[PDB]
Amino acid sequence: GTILIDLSPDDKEFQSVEEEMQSTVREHRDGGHAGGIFNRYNILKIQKVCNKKLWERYTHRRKEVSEENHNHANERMLFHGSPFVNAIIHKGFDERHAYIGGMFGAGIYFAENSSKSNQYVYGIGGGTGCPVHKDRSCYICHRQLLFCRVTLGKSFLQFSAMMAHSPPGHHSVTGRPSVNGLALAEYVIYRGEQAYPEYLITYQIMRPE
Numbered sequence: 525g526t527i528l529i530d531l532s533p534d535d536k537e538f539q540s541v542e543e544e545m546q547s548t549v550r551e552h553r554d555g556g557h558a559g560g561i562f563n564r565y566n567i568l569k570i571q572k573v574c575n576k577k578l579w580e581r582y583t584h585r586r587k588e589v590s591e592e593n594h595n596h597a598n599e600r601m602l603f604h605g606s607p608f609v610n611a612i613i614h615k616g617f618d619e620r621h622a623y624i625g626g627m628f629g630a631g632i633y634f635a636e637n638s639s640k641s642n643q644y645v646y647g648i649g650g651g652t653g654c655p656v657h658k659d660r661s662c663y664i665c666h667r668q669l670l671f672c673r674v675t676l677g678k679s680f681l682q683f684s685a686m687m688a689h690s691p692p693g694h695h696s697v698t699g700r701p702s703v704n705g706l707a708l709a710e711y712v713i714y715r716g717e718q719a720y721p722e723y724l725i726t727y728q729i730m731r732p733e
C-alpha cells in the first residue's frame with residue numbers, strides 16, 4: 525500500500541521541510557541526554573509517504589472533526605519521532621504508538637520542536653541510543669522523523685510546568701510549556717486516524733563546531 529517518493533533537494537518542497545526541521549531545534553533541559561548534543565541537522569533524504577487507504581482514513585476523520593468544531597479541522601504539521609517509524613508509514617498510527625506514561629495521558633504525541641521529537645527516535649528518553657553504537661548523541665547513524673498532518677479539532681489547552689480519551693467536547697490536547705519561554709507546544713491525539721505521516725525525514729544530528 526505505501527510508496528515513498530523522494531524529493532529533490534532542488535525542490536522548494538524539500539527545502540521548506542528542511543527549513544521547518546532546522547528552524548525548530550532548541551536546547552533541551554536534559555543538556556542533550558536523550559537526543560544528543562547539536563544545533564542543526566545534516567538532512568540526508570526527504571520522502572513523501574503515499575498510501576491511499578491511510579489518506580482516506582485520515583481525511584474521513586478530518587471531515588468528522590471539522591464538522592464538530594465551528595467548521596475548523598485545526599490541522600497542523602508537527603514532528604513525531606519513534607522507533608516504530610517503519611510500521612507507522614505502512615500501517616498508520618494506532619494505540620501501540622501511544623505513550624502510556626506521557627504527561628497528558630495515554631495518546632499519540634507530536635511536537636512543534638523537531639529537536640523534541642528527536643529525543644524519541646531511539647525510544648522514550650532516547651532509549652539506549654543508536655542500535656550500532658548505543659550512543660544517544662550518535663553523529664554517524666542515520667535517524668528518521670515523521671513530519672505529519674495532525675487534526676487537532678477543538679484542542680484542550682493544558683499548561684505544563686516545563687489509549688485514553690480527549691477531554692469531553694475536545695478532539696486533542698495542547699501541552700504548552702509555561703516555564704521555558706522558548707519551548708514550543710506538544711499535542712496529543714487519542715485516535716490514530718487523526719494524523720497522517722506525510723513526510724519521512726532521514727538525517728544525522730551534527731556535532732557542534
Ligand SMILES: O=c1[nH]nc(Cl)c2ccccc12
Nearest residue numbers: 604605623633634635641644
Ligand atoms: O515526537 C514524539 N514522539 N514520541 C513521543 Cl512519546 C513524544 C512525546 C512528547 C513530544 C514529542 C514526541
Ligand SMILES: [Zn+2]
Nearest residue numbers: 654657662665
Ligand atoms: Zn551510532
